[PDB]
């Protein structure tokens, strides 16, 4: 069974328990139940799935190293499913709910979930609520027996809480930190003091790196039995490296990419947000470029915002953006090497990992 | 030490712990900590703690019976505060993301969180999402090594699943059930057919009921060691009857205690909800009070909202709480007694609740 046709089959299945047992135990009537097959759909699907086959993929290494039974290799393979189908459910609330937080228009060439005509914010927040609550639903019916459970469990939940903690980070990411304050409201920076390498890098790595790369290499290794054959600080130190790189291309996308092959018109400029491209920006600029760039950046007029994006062609941000490729390939590398000392079956998925981030 | 001095203490432990775990590892800075800090306050404290204080107070009687070191003792009443906690927080989140759902304005004499100047719906959506990854970190630090870690986390699991399902069934109750489709802009019922009893139960069963008294009785006996004294089957009945009797009255209250003793507005009228005055005026009303109804129902309208309360006045609906009172007593007693026969200890707890809900 290729591993894709393994991983989507086990999606339905999924689906068919957590419908049924709303039918049979949470008196669910048929319509509802469809508006909440429907909404799983809409949330679940229609992405690369890279989240939940990086735990697939991480699990067949090491069955290719191991012996097992054959029943035992289904079970590992059909956990490694249903471990990779969680993570996708706790991405697919956090894309409902921070669609909703930003007024986002568009997610994968569809309308947010949130517009949906019958659906509406009011419903949308709550069935961001069930998303989440899904994925627990899910470990504790197809894992209640297991050995990982306990290590599973506390993993996704501090994953998931550091995934809240970086949201926080990037939607305060254009205040200034001394001015933070519940009773007042916040005039965006001025100085942008507080866009920095350092400041970036807490933003990404809480709000991206954990749920996109940590969780599922870490899934993949418990669902195999295979954790203590590896060193969990090179994990976190790689995990974090390729996490950046797959947000600081994704910063230089909404910026860049046309909204067709993007699948949503970018907006961080608008948004203010402390992207990649504003940092490395402010990295690099004069004083007449800053000046221009304080001028423009953070409002929705697109005179401005195209200003802003002649700004960052003019200051020849690609040489910088290959600059630090060449620098992730270095340590990416050099971390993959280290974890072959110990597992070089779990090195080599490292790799493909961080093939299919560094081409896509 | 009086039960709520012991609780209102752990709650200052707790807020110490998560915010002093958010700068050690979360690097966290000290305004963001601030913030945090005003929100867990903000939407944490300030009610009656009705929930969290079950948890102590069906500890409080199992300690009164049983045989424990003063250690032990501490360590239960400790763990029952901070399962109380837990289910304060849990609280928390559910209502910062309904007062955004609702669109409410004001909560316990105060704006929703939501509504506070420098939070907004794109801070607040999110600030609730931590409140609930906060019963989790507190659950994983301070019930590591407890033997009912593992029961804890699938109830808790259970009923926060149960009152998200039980959200969807209350914003929807206004729509008919055949007509409910993502696609499609919802208009709101005409004919009031699923205005039932029944179905009225359905949507408090799982809204409240099971978050406000079966989670607070059963980690109570969790934290104890004492779930195998008690019938479960018993102590889902009962929570079920005592939760349903608090909606009713709740659903009173919306329509008919004064804003500035309710904290609020009350908008049920308005908002076209499935109310316990909806459905018994729906119960006794002739045709064409029927009609008028219709007329009038769900509509900001201020005149179209007297004509509804004027409508349940002159239905003499007084009459009906009181006949649902009186039935509700036998029941609960009826239960109670029934608890008698495996734990007397547990039953008075029961009691208690029971009264404390009955007069407040
Ligand atoms: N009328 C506007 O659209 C202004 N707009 C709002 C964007 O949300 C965004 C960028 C900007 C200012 C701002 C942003 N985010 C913040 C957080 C704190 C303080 C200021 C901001
Ligand atoms: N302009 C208004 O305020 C109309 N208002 C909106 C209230 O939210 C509410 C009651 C009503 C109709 C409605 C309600 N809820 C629903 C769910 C599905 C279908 C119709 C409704
Ligand atoms: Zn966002
Ligand atoms: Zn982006
Ligand atoms: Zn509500
Ligand atoms: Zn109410």
Redesign the interface.
Known sequence: MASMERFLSVYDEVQAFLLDQ?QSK????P??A???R??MD?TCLGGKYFRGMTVVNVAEGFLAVTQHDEATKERILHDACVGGWMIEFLQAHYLV?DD???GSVMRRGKPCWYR????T???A???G??LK??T??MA?HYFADRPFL?DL??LF??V???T??G???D??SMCD??????????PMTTDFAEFTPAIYK?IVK?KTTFYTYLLPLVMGLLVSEAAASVEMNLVERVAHLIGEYFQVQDDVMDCFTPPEQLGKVGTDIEDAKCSWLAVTFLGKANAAQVAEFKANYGEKDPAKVAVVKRLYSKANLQADFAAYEAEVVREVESLIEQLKVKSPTFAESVAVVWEKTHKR
């Open positions: 709303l949470y008196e669910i009537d319509n509802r469809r508006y909440l429907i909404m809409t709910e909703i937080m930003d949906f005509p019958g659906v914010t009011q419903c927040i709550n069935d609520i069930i609550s899904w627990q639903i504790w306990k469990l506390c939940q501090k998931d809480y550091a809240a903690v949201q926080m980070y939607v305060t930190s001394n001015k933070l304050d519940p009773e007042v409201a916040q807490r809480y």
